[PDB]
Amino acid sequence: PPVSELITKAVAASKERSGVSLAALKKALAAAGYDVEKNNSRIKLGLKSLVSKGTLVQTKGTGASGSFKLNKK
DNA sequence: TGTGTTTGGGAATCCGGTGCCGAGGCCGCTCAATTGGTCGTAGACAGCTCTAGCACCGCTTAAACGCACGTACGCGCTGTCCCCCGC
C-alpha cells in the first residue's frame, strides 16, 4: 500500500488539536511495520505531496519538520 | 488566549544583648643586631679586538590576495523523552 494511505491512517488514528509530528509519524509507521529508516526520504516526499495536495495542513514549523493535521475541508 | 500586577510566604538580612576568648599591651630576659677595625678580593673601569647585526640592492618565483562559485555546516526551530531537582 502507498505511504500516503499509511500516513493518512496514522494521522487519523492519532487525531488531536495539535497535530502528529514527524517523530510521531515515524513511530506510528514503524509500529505499523513500515521501515521508516530506508524510506524516510520517501516519507518526506510523500508527506510533502500530501501537503501539496492540501490533504494535510501544516500547523507549525515549515515543511516535514512541522506538525500536521488532516484537512477536514 | 494572552499580557501584566499583586500577595502570602519562606528565606536572607538587620538589630540588640551577651559572653568569651584571643589580640594587644606590659615586663623580664637574652641573643642577635650593631660598632669598630683588619684584610682580602670582586668587580668597576679603561681599553682593545673582531664579529655579527644592520642597511641596502637586485632578481626570481613562490606565496599572498582578490574574486567567482557552490555546498555543507552552523544555527534556529520543533518535538519528545528522560533524568536531575526539589522535598
Swiss-Prot record:
N6-(beta-hydroxybutyryl)lysine: residues carrying this PTM: K15, K27, K48, K53, K69
Modified residues (N6-(2-hydroxyisobutyryl)lysine): K9, K15, K26, K27, K38, K44, K48, K53, K60, K73
Residue numbers bearing the Citrulline modification: R17
Compartments, record wording: Nucleus; Chromosome
Gene, per the UniProt record: H1-2
Domain annotation H15: ranges: 1-72
PTM info: H1 histones are progressively phosphorylated during the cell cycle, becoming maximally phosphorylated during late G2 phase and M phase, and being dephosphorylated sharply thereafter. Crotonylation (Kcr) is specifically present in male germ cells and marks testis-specific genes in post-meiotic cells, including X-linked genes that escape sex chromosome inactivation in haploid cells. Crotonylation marks active promoters and enhancers and confers resistance to transcriptional repressors. It is also associated with post-meiotically activated genes on autosomes.
Purpose: Histone H1 protein binds to linker DNA between nucleosomes forming the macromolecular structure known as the chromatin fiber. Histones H1 are necessary for the condensation of nucleosome chains into higher-order structured fibers. Also acts as a regulator of individual gene transcription through chromatin remodeling, nucleosome spacing and DNA methylation.
N6-crotonyllysine, modified sites: K27, K48, K53, K60
Positions where N6-succinyllysine occurs in the chain: K60
Name assigned to this protein: Histone H1.2
Chain positions with Phosphoserine modification: S67
Family, as annotated: Belongs to the histone H1/H5 family.
Complex formation: Interacts with TSC22D1 isoforms 2 and 5.
Domain notes: The C-terminal domain is required for high-affinity binding to chromatin.
